[PDB]
From a paper:
At the molecular level, OGDHc is a megadalton-size assembly of multiple copies of three enzymes, namely E1o (oxoglutarate dehydrogenase, EC 1.2.4.2), [name] (dihydrolipoyl succinyltransferase, EC 2.3.1.61) and E3 (dihydrolipoyl dehydrogenase, EC 1.8.1.4). [name] forms the core of the complex with a stable stoichiometry of 24 copies in a cubic assembly, whereas the E1o and E3 proteins assemble on its periphery to carry out the complete reaction in a yet stoichiometrically and structurally unknown high-order metabolon.
We further report the high-resolution cryo-EM structure of the OGDHc core ([name]), which displays various structural adaptations. The EM map displays higher-order structural features, e.g., inter-, and intra- trimeric interfaces, captures secondary structure elements and accurately places amino-acid side chains. F247 has an outward-facing orientation to accommodate the CoA, interacting and stabilizing the CoA 3’,5’-adenosine diphosphate group via π-stacking. The limited presence of electron density for the CoA pantoic acid, β-alanine, and cysteamine components underlies the inherent flexibility of endogenously bound coenzyme A with implications for function. A major difference lies in the fact that, compared to bacterial PDHc, which could be trapped in a proposed resting state with all LDs bound to the E2 active sites, the present eukaryotic OGDHc highlights an alternative resting state where LDs are sub-stoichiometrically and transiently interacting with the E2 core. By contrast, in C. thermophilum this element obtains a β-strand (E188-M194) conformation which, along with a β-hairpin motif of residues N266 - D282 creates an extended β-sheet. This adaptation contributes to the stabilization of the core via extensive hydrogen bonding and affects subunit inter-communication in the higher-order state of the 24-meric cubic [name] core. In line with this notion, C. thermophilum intra- and inter-subunit interfaces are 1.7 and 1.5 times larger than the corresponding interfaces of the human [name] core and include extensive charge-charge interactions.
Residue numbers in the entry:
A (entry chain A): 211 to 420
B (entry chain A), C (entry chain A), D (entry chain A): 188 to 420
The structure:
Amino acid sequence: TAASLTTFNEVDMSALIEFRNKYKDEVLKKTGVKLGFMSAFSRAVVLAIRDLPVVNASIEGPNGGDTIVYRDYVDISVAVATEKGLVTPVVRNAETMDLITIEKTIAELGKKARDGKLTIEDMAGGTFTISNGGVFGSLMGTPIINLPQSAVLGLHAIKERPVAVNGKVEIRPMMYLALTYDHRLLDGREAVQFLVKVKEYIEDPRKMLL
Amino acid sequence: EERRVKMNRMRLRIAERLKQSQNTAASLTTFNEVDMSALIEFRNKYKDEVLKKTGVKLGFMSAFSRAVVLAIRDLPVVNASIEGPNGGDTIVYRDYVDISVAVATEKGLVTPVVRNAETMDLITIEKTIAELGKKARDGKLTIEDMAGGTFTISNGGVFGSLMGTPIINLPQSAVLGLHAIKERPVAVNGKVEIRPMMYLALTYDHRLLDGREAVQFLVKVKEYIEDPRKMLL
Amino acid sequence: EERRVKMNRMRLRIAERLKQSQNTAASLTTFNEVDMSALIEFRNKYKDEVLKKTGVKLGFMSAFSRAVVLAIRDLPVVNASIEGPNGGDTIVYRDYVDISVAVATEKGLVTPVVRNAETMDLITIEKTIAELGKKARDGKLTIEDMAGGTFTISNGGVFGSLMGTPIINLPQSAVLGLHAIKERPVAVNGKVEIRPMMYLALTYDHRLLDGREAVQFLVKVKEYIEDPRKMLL
Amino acid sequence: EERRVKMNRMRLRIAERLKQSQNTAASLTTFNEVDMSALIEFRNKYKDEVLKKTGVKLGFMSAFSRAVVLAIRDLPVVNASIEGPNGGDTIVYRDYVDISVAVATEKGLVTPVVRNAETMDLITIEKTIAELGKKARDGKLTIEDMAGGTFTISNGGVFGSLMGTPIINLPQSAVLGLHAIKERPVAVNGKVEIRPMMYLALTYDHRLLDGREAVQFLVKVKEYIEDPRKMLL
């Protein structure tokens, strides 16, 4: 019930690594949260949805008389491993919140997942989805949609590979990406600019600062 | 050899209020050095980007105002004010920041405050700065556009300044100073090379500030400016 | 958006006495640059040595206080004081020096003076500094431990300061400023290399100091600090 | 341990007039950096030349006074003065400049003004400086040699000063500061090398100056000093 199409891209990630380590120790001293990549990816996703609203759409019509939605609020769903398998508790409205509170709520969901208190309503809903396959040894892959959602991003275990940056070849820790469309909503155009904008935000967070 | 010239009302009033802003507030100034190259590259690249996208001129003042907002958010004594009538004071602590910026004009210096800027990013800061600038070039700035204000950022960088001691804007409590970034030798990462660094200033109100709060204020502003990634947190 | 908070008695009194310490004393500030590497090596080696021997933490403040004592000994106008009641003044010249040091605390800044320090070496200076520090951490400092004082050394170096304008501590006449030694390029012996130098400050009382006495005071302190062998004389 | 010593009339009067020169004038200080090697080579070569020719000692103060005269000529607000009796002010604009220089003596600091110096070159400036110096060494300077004066150049360079905040000489409006040129690393023409640069100061009267006029004043003085060929225009 959803035309799935996947697109990949390559993103250099060294700046994110140095940023994350230095201000991870800084923020652990200050507030006490573990800075990670998922907060940056979620924030870039939020911005790229803010500048293109068709990703948060949804075909809720009962197979006919559809009522395509456009929503300002984003309820990004993250994945945490558990004994049952994969658990996807959504964060609440995250269109207006920074990296620090994103990481705080991610840690909250993680601790609520490790010791099981996650009830049904913590999994219901959700407009976007970020699935981390990076903890494993993945390189690329085709994710699935989470109907009635419309897109799903994929994180793929950043690795050291040769690059053609600034006219020379050297090793940089780059990373692959994925985006499963719903081509009855996305047109390859909106999704490709979505993913490339996420990529350029990730390449340097200074762009995300705007 | 000397001509007899009177003055205008605004000159007398600014003289009186400037003298009042010095005998009722203990003024202390602190300086620091900040490397600024990262801000320059950021500003040029995403200045052309943002001019293409929205149509505003990215500049340093937006970054400085945002760093000031964050450093006030993590220390609330800078936005304080002794409003008590010389006695029975009622020191204020305010969440909203109404940073006042300075724009040159024919009358002299004009300081129209921006409204609540605690919750707004660089882009809208630059947008409202440009709005105030155009309202200053063609004069439509009424009285209420100058009234109020909790902080103040004064740009002496357009001129050829290097350092200097600013004044307070009573009933304010602190004033930052921008001082015309210049290329000077640096002792960075064990080597000496030319980097475009910049000086800073902060005029305290030592009956409110203690050198401690103001010095951490200024050093936090400095470290935010050195790399905006820190300001991103 | 703003809360109504009163104050405490000590805040009102410090505000009043700080304003009084500015409208009754002409304050002028001078800066200088001092290389500090020799002090660093001296301090680390004989800090471990003296911790083994007597059990005190060797630091820079002892060296600065001793240099201040010597430079006052060779110029007696710094320890002066205008004690006359606004008229019929009786300018003082005193052989004893009662240097006041600053220690941070929960109340804010605490300035307990050391007693007569004109005749005592670095080791006992550090010992009494540690004594005052422990008496400040666990509060036993009574009123008489803060009363009096002829000079004042304020450490803003623990923070991230670079320079700044200190205030006088009326009825005192001068205040030194320590400003967080940093690695900066130097033009020493015809070459440029990184050395950990440091800034300084001196708030005059220009109705007593003339810029001449204070400038030779500060330059003599600087040259004593550059190599303690000079202080040995 | 302390002796009872009274004062003299001139000490009381200088204290009173120095306090008056601070509570009736908003004082603000600005600094800048100026390379000075060209002045050094110029001064030595044509100092021996002019000692052979006319018999005067070429020095830096003549060049600084001439640059000050030119920069006042291109901006007339520095020679202003608020002579109004606390009200109904009559701000002055004067073509003639009566720069006051400072010479050390047994009494302390002596500031005899030179007469109209808007139309006179470096040679006669040095000649009148030497005349004032010899009249100061053997005391013949009467009262009228100290009265008046519109500007003031204070030399703290003979001492070991690096920077500092000068005072105004009310009813004057600005004071320059010379600060003992030193060898420091520079970021000139893309490379780092040792050049004998120098700091500067300018104490405003902010009820007359606006930071704008004073900053262009000081930067123009700086650029004139950097190469006297500009002063030749």
